[PDB]
């Protein structure tokens, strides 16, 4: 009654197990993939630069975003202060955007390597340029939430929130949220779906089974991306059409469910690399010994 969102301990135990499993799986898989590529000295190739960029972005995503957001979502209390409030609204959101753009770049590599194999690959300096552009626009898109971030002290509560400039119609936050929803959901889903559809049509039509396994992998990647990232943007576009839903504990249960669903996509790519390539299986066996 002085403050809601104080869950009983059994819900905290269940959510702690369900989040701890995915953060351990995500960070162990991502750092083993990074160690496999960057340590063996034969996997250090211009091809795998976008792969280690995606793995680093996904690991930073999983660790920082999921741990801090689960801690802030258990009791709706902030334990970190103003500087870490601004840092959490600046950097892990940029890690999310950089991971999605890195996955788009990997899909572009696969499309260019399979559809046009006789054409030469991108240069190493061009690969570094695309990495730099991906991270620069990721930080530039995540900057206005980390700039306007502030903390406030309520009775027995400390809150971190983005304090938008006051408007009679809230135009600035509406334009920012619709633009970030478009640029983060709709454009890379369409690009990855088009490229993977063309590649799957080409490869689908001994060695046939490996190509069909690749097509099944790309179908799985597109479907899990769309399913895992739909309710995240649904929730973050929700308060501008019905802002009264944040007066109950049902919305923290919804937030915990959608954050588990969004952050569970980090586990998927090391399992995919382990299933497809035998060299990654040998690296996983070598790292675990």
């Amino acid at each position: 009654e002085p403050n809601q969102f104080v869950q009983p301990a059994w819900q905290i135990v269940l959510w702690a197990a369900a989040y701890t499993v995915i953060v351990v799986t995500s960070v162990v898989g991502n750092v083993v993939v990074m160690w496999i590529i960057l340590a063996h000295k034969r996997m250090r190739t211009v091809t795998n630069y976008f792969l280690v960029n995606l793995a680093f972005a996904e690991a930073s995503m999983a660790a920082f975003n999921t741990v801090v957001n689960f801690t802030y979502a258990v009791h709706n209390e902030w334990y970190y202060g103003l500087f870490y409030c601004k840092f959490h609204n600046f950097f892990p959101i940029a890690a999310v955007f950089a991971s999605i753009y890195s996955m788009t770049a990997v899909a572009f590599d696969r499309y260019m390597a399979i559809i046009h194999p006789l054409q030469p690959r991108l240069s190493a300096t061009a690969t570094k340029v695309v990495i730099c552009v991906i991270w620069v626009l990721a930080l530039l898109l995540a900057f206005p939430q980390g700039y306007y971030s502030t903390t406030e002290t309520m009775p027995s509560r400390v809150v971190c929130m983005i304090e938008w400039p006051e408007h009679p119609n809230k135009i600035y936050e509406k334009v920012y949220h619709i633009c970030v929803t478009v640029l983060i959901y709709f454009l890379p889903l369409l690009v990855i779906g088009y490229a993977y559809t063309v590649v799957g049509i080409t490869l689908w039509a001994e060695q046939v089974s490996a190509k069909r396994k690749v097509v099944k992998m790309m179908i799985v990647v597109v479907c899990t991306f769309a399913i895992c990232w739909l309710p995240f943007h649904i929730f973050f576009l929700l308060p501008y059409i019905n802002p009264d839903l944040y007066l109950k504990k049902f919305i923290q249960q919804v937030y915990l469910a959608i954050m588990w669903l969004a952050m569970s996509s980090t586990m998927y790519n090391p399992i995919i690399y382990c299933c497809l390539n035998d060299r990654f299986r040998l690296g996983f066996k070598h790292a675990f010994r």
């Binding site: 969102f5 979502a73 999310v96 009775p155 809150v159 971190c160 973050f236 919305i251």
Partner: peptide, 11 residues
């Protein structure tokens, strides 16, 4: 800031 019962979810 508008209410003490607000959730304030973050990305």
């Amino acid at each position: 800031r508008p209410k003490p019962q607000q959730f304030f979810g973050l990305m």
